[PDB]
Every structure is written in C-alpha cells, then in structure tokens.
C-alpha cells in the first residue's frame, strides 16, 4: 500500500491486562506505526521518572467524574505523561482506558484477552507472586539490579488495584483475582462500543490487528512472541549472575 504520513498521538488505547501479549502488541504497534508505545517496560527501562507520576495520577484518580475542573487537570496530567507516544499497552495505562477514551476522542480500543488459568499462571511467574513463593526474592534481586525499589511495586500493585477498581486486594487469593480477571474484561466489552473495540486472543496475530487499523500487514515480518515467563525467569537469574543490564542486554534482542 501508499506510505502515509501518520500524526504522532494516541491511536489505539488498549485495555488490556498484564501477561495477556501487551509487551508483543507494543512490538507489533511500534512495527506499525513507526513511533513509541507506552509499556511499563517504558517506564523500567526509559522512563522511571515517570513512577511517582502515575503513583500521583491514581491517588487522585478516584475524584474524577464521568468534566469537572479536577478531572480537566488529571486529564491534562495523562496527556502530557503520554506525549510522543502513540498507542497505549500495559500497566499502569491500562486501568485508564475509559478516560484515554475521552482524552483520544479519535482513537481505537483493543483488548487482549487468554485462558484465565494461564493469565493466573503467568501473573504468578511474573508480576504477582504469592507471598510465600521463593521465586519473588530472586524476582526482587534481579529488578534491583534494574534500580527498580519499592515504589516500582507499589505503582505495579496500585494500578492493578485501580484496574479492577478495588480499595483493597488480596494479592495472594487466587481465586479473587480470577474473579477480578474475568470481571474487568467483560467491563471493559460492555463498556466500549463495540465499532471501537477489537478483542485480542494470544495466537491471533497481524490480521485482525491490522484489519481494524486499516493498515498493510507488516512485509517479511512475524507478530512478535516475547516476553515469556520463561524468557522473564532467564532475565532475572542473568541480571542477579551480572548484576547489570548491560552486561546481559545483547541477549535480549527484541524483549527489551
Ligand atoms: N505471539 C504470541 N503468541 C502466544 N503467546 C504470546 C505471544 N506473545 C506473548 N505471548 C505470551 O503472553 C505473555 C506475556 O504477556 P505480557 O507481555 O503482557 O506480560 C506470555 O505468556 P506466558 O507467561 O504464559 O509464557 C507470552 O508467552
């Protein structure tokens, strides 16, 4: 197809959770369109500036109403946070779909969904294990490594709960957050029109993706598949064996 030139703002929000291919939908949105996507691995590893500004944005994120004069401000705080890039992917972003909706009147929703079980899974190897797994002290090492400390899991831990819109969670009851999994994906259908809305399972690929955004299938190249709990569990036993990033980074090509 013709080459076009593309504005530089928020195409597509996508709502969904972690562990179900945000990090995969950044590579494919970014192979698309040619300018940054916004991941939390954005923030870890380009922008950990940002931590206390979302931390900021979701304690006041409970006053905003479906314009008042305090939503304006947060809304002004969101845009600027997200300026430069143009599609959204992952925590802390993620819990914000409904508002990025307002904020990008013209762009489009995805969401990425999978197995409930293999989302639980994953979460546990990953992002969210229990507290009594010995896995999440060899997690911890490694992302001090990355300069990542407790605020990083605050914000991790916070903007999940804003996500499921829960006061408080308890992290370690999987069934809770099953139930909270399932609940948010099917807010999140109800809620966005569908005309704006496209459903994502792992294993779909470029077409449906593509279809939606009205652009050519990316030439030569596969839909990425990174960000394994496999490939997370190898990055973390590397960076606590070097103990820098950089030492390690050349073997991680396209996940980082
Ligand atoms: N193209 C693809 N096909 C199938 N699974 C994919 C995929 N891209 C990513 N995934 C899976 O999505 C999860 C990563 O999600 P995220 O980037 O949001 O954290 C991983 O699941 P597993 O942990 O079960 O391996 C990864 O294997």
Same mark, same amino acid.
């Given at each position: 197809?013709?080459?076009?030139?593309?504005?530089?703002?928020?195409?597509?929000?996508?709502?969904?959770?972690?562990?179900?291919?945000?990090?995969?939908?950044?590579?494919?949105?970014?192979?698309?369109y040619?300018?940054?996507?916004y991941?939390?691995?954005?923030?870890?590893?380009?922008?950990?500036?940002?931590?206390?500004?979302?931390?900021?944005?979701?304690?006041?994120?409970?006053?905003?109403?479906?314009?008042?004069?305090?939503?304006?401000a947060?809304?002004?705080?969101?845009?600027?946070?997200?300026?430069?890039?143009?599609?959204?992917?992952?925590?802390?972003?993620?819990?914000?779909?409904?508002?990025?909706?307002?904020?990008?009147?013209?762009?489009?929703?995805?969401?990425?969904? =999978?197995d409930?079980?293999?989302?639980?899974? !994953?979460? +546990?190897?990953? @992002? &969210?294990?229990?507290?009594?797994?010995?896995?999440? /002290?060899?997690?911890?090492?490694?992302?001090?490594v990355?300069?990542?400390?407790?605020?990083?899991?605050?914000?991790?831990?916070?903007?999940?709960?804003?996500?499921?819109?829960?006061?408080?969670?308890?992290?370690?009851?999987?069934?809770?957050?099953?139930?909270?999994?399932?609940?948010?994906? =099917?807010?999140?259908?109800?809620?966005?029109? !569908?005309? +704006?809305?496209? @459903? &994502?399972?792992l294993?779909?690929?470029?077409?449906? /993706?593509?279809?939606?955004?009205?652009?050519?299938?990316?030439?030569?190249?596969?839909?990425?598949?990174?960000?394994?709990?496999?490939?997370?569990?190898?990055?973390?036993?590397?960076?606590?064996?070097?103990?820098?990033?950089?030492?390690?980074?050349?073997?991680?090509?396209?996940?980082?």
């Amino acid at each position: 197809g013709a080459m076009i030139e593309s504005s530089t703002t928020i195409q597509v929000i996508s709502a969904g959770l972690p562990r179900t291919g945000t990090k995969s939908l950044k590579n494919a949105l970014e192979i698309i369109y040619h300018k940054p996507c916004y991941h939390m691995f954005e923030i870890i590893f380009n922008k950990q500036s940002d931590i206390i500004k979302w931390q900021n944005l979701i304690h006041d994120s409970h006053m905003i109403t479906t314009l008042t004069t305090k939503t304006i401000a947060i809304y002004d705080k969101l845009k600027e946070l997200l300026d430069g890039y143009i599609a959204t992917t992952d925590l802390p972003t993620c819990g914000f779909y409904k508002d990025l909706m307002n904020i990008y009147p013209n762009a489009k929703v995805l969401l990425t969904i =999978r197995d409930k079980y293999d989302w639980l899974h !994953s979460l +546990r190897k990953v @992002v &969210l294990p229990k507290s009594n797994d010995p896995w999440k /002290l060899k997690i911890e090492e490694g992302d001090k490594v990355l300069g990542l400390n407790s605020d990083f899991y605050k914000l991790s831990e916070d903007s999940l709960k804003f996500a499921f819109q829960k006061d408080d969670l308890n992290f370690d009851d999987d069934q809770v957050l099953l139930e909270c999994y399932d609940e948010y994906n =099917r807010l999140v259908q109800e809620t966005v029109p !569908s005309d +704006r809305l496209l @459903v &994502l399972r792992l294993g779909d690929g470029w077409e449906p /993706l593509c279809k939606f955004l009205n652009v050519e299938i990316p030439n030569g190249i596969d839909y990425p598949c990174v960000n394994s709990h496999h490939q997370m569990t190898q990055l973390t036993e590397q960076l606590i064996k070097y103990k820098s990033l950089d030492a390690i980074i050349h073997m991680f090509p396209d996940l980082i």
